[PDB]
Amino acid sequence: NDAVSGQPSIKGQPVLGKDDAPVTVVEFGDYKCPSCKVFNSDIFPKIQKDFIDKGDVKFSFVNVMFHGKGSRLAALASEEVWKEDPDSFWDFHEKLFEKQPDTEQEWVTPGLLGDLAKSTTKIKPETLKENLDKETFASQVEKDSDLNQKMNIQATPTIYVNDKVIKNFADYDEIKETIEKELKG
Ligand SMILES: [Ca+2]
């Protein structure tokens, strides 16, 4: 009972990289996932430099709800940024992972998310914060949830390289080699 092999649809999802990048890397992640915090700092910048910058890979992120209410809030704020300020999306995304503490208990508040919006985006904190309260972008969260279930996501982050499921997100060798194999044929 693992993640299913197959190309996940990135239709309607946040993307970074050239439109015609031949390889799509998809992260199924969670803003409260400590491994996703590690992927963001340790692995993602290498994917950027080695592949995204040169147009080989486009990267996408799909929300997964494994850590309770804080995961939902963070997902909702994330969905709004992509919709309302796409060009700023990745600065907000990375700064949220960087704001994740190394402690267990809840930390995701509307106030924190609004403050990240303020510093990284065109979006007004009170606009976020109003939308979070009303759960305006719930449908985008449920869209991702449907996709997580279709792909049978068991743990975060789960990385896809085209139709290939990466066994270890923190093994950059596996990730680089799989991107390069996909790039060949
Ligand atoms: Ca999404």
From Swiss-Prot:
Keywords associated with the record: Cell membrane, Competence, Disulfide bond, Membrane, Oxidoreductase, Redox-active center, Signal
Keyword field contains Ligase: no
Cysteine-cysteine disulfides: C33-C36
GO terms for biological process, alphabetical: establishment of competence for transformation
Subcellular location: Cell membrane; Membrane raft
Residues of the Thioredoxin domain: 1-184
Main subcellular location: membrane
Effect of a null allele: Cells partially restore cytochrome c oxidase activity in a CcdA-deficient mutant, possibly because the bacteria can no longer oxidize the 2 heme-binding thiol groups in apocytochrome c.
One MF annotation (Gene Ontology) recorded for this entry: oxidoreductase activity
A GO cellular component annotation in the UniProt record: plasma membrane
Protein task: Required for the stabilization, possibly via formation of a disulfide bond, of the obligatory competence protein ComGC. May be required for the stability of secreted proteins with disulfide bonds. Not required for sporulation.
Family membership noted in the UniProt record: Belongs to the thioredoxin family. DsbA subfamily.
Protein name in UniProt: Disulfide bond formation protein D
Lineage: Bacteria, Bacillati, Bacillota, Bacilli, Bacillales
Encoding gene (name): bdbD
